Design a protein around this ligand. Structure first.
Ligand code: NAG
Lengths: 50, 50
C-alpha cells in the first residue's frame, strides 16, 4: 500500500487559517483582518511641488 | 499397506504425516509532518526616531 497526501494552504489577510476551518467561516471572518492586495502609486518626485 | 496371506493372516500398516507452516509479516510506516507559519504584522521603525 502507499498513501501520500500533501496539503498546502496560503492565506493573505483574514483569520489565521487552520486545517479544520470552513470556507464560509473564512469569508465571514475577514470583518477586521484585511491586507492590501493591489496598489497604485506615483513616483515620489511628483509630490515635491510648490 | 495391506497384506493378506492364506485369506487368514492380515496385516495393515497406515502411516500419515502432515505438516502445516504459516508465516505472516506486516509492516507499517507512517510519516506525518505539519508546518504552520503565521506572519501577522510587520513592525518597522519610523524614519524620525530618536
Ligand atoms: C489511504 O489508504 C487507504 C487504504 O486502505 C485507501 O482506502 C485510501 O483511499 C487512502 N487515502 C486516504 C486519503 O485515506
Amino acid at each position: 500500500l502507499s498513501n501520500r497526501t500533501n496539503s498546502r494552504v496560503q492565506s493573505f489577510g483574514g483569520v489565521p487559517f487552520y486545517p479544520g476551518i470552513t470556507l464560509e467561516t473564512w469569508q465571514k471572518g475577514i470583518t477586521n483582518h484585511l491586507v492590501a492586495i493591489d496598489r497604485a502609486g506615483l513616483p515620489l518626485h511628483f509630490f515635491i511641488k510648490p | 499397506t495391506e497384506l493378506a496371506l492364506f485369506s487368514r493372516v492380515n496385516g495393515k500398516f497406515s502411516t500419515e504425516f502432515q505438516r502445516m507452516k504459516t508465516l505472516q509479516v506486516k509492516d507499517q510506516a507512517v510519516t506525518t509532518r505539519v508546518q504552520v507559519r503565521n506572519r501577522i504584522y510587520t513592525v518597522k521603525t519610523t524614519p524620525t526616531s530618536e
